[PDB]
């Protein structure tokens, strides 16, 4: 397939690795009583391992000659679940955090001693600003349009 890689659901090395891990777990499982707690924990680990391999196989990942999954990040539409969609989620969350921080700093700077409100948080004020990160992409865009996001170079100084 892409870059000489093979789908993990059809890779012999992938199945070999799964079998080796399951055998290694079963060798430890064969040391305890069937109804003891360690046996149940090892059995749960075995079931989890089988589920992990099955999900990797059926989610469309690609495997190399080593028998391990590899990620594709060039933009191909068959692999957006690997980088692009989680990346959009990361950007959304990070923008929320940054936007609420900047809005708190701007709202608090008008007081007599703003620094006192930076080592002791005003939770009453922050609890009104936290929910507003929900629409940060709209607010930031509108603020950029109207020229409220950036300070002119002439005005920057201590």
């Amino acid at each position: 397939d892409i870059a000489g890689l093979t789908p993990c659901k059809d890779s012999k090395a992938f199945a070999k690795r799964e079998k080796q891990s399951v055998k290694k777990l079963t060798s430890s499982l064969k040391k305890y009583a069937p109804d003891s707690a360690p046996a149940l924990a090892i059995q749960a680990t075995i079931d989890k391992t089988k589920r992990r391999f099955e999900n990797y196989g059926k989610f469309g990942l690609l495997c190399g000659s080593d028998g391990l999954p590899h990620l594709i990040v060039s933009g191909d539409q068959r692999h957006w679940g690997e980088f692009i969609t989680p990346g959009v989620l990361f950007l959304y969350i990070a923008g929320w955090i940054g936007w609420v921080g900047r809005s708190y700093l701007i709202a608090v700077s008008g007081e007599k001693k703003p620094a006192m409100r930076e080592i002791i948080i005003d939770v009453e004020l922050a609890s009104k600003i936290i929910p507003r990160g929900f629409i940060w992409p709209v607010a930031a865009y509108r603020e950029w349009i109207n020229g409220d996001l950036v300070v002119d170079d002439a005005d920057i100084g201590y």
């Binding site: 629409i135 709209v138 509108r142």
Partner: protein
């Protein structure tokens, strides 16, 4: 008149009640800036009218065919049908026809009265009006633009937007169309809800 979306809450200072549909609802302070308010006022009307049209033309054919007087596919399959022209041609026609009308609408938002003139026949124009509510040709029967009618339009548009969101979400979990989902709820009301859908 100006009501309250939440009985017992104070209204924002910038929502004094000079706009149709004012109910003091802006918890996240999107419209604190006066210009943002105008932009959102226009966007509300546009997204709402499109949603109303979409819901009507998305629901009526289904019930018409289910009655038995027509044989048409569901709304989520009509894009995969046989038409006299391919989908690409229709998209290109749509894009070309819409760039013109949308920039024409944009130029009036930027400065009212700028694009009232007819380009070809230099004898027709639009009399003075308010942005979002033109008249003349766009009002053939020449109804009365009273405050009551604007509120009646806004209420149905706001309802239609939620209806379209509901259709979109209900298709991605059930996959059987709106009317089938309604009849399933009406068959066993206590055993057919969203809870049974996920379990």
């Amino acid at each position: 008149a100006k009501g309250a979306w939440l009985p017992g809450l104070a209204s924002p200072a910038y929502l004094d009640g000079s706009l149709a549909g004012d109910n003091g609802f802006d918890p996240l302070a999107l419209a604190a800036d006066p210009e943002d308010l105008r932009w959102f006022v226009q966007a509300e009307l546009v997204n709402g009218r499109w949603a109303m049209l979409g819901v009507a033309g998305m629901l009526i054919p289904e019930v018409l065919t289910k009655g038995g007087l027509l044989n048409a596919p569901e709304w989520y399959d009509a894009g995969k049908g046989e038409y006299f022209a391919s989908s690409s041609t229709l998209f290109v026609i749509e894009f070309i026809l819409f760039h013109y009308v949308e920039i024409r609408r944009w130029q009036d938002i930027k400065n009212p009265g700028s694009v009232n003139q007819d380009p070809i026949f230099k004898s027709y124009s639009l009399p003075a009006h308010e942005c979002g509510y033109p008249g003349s040709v766009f009002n053939p029967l020449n109804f009365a633009p009273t405050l009551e009618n604007k509120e009646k339009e806004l209420a149905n548009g706001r309802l239609a937007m939620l209806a379209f969101l509901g259709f979109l979400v209900q298709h991605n979990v059930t996959g059987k169309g709106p009317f089938e989902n309604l009849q399933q709820h009406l068959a066993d009301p206590w055993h057919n809800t969203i809870i049974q859908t996920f379990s």
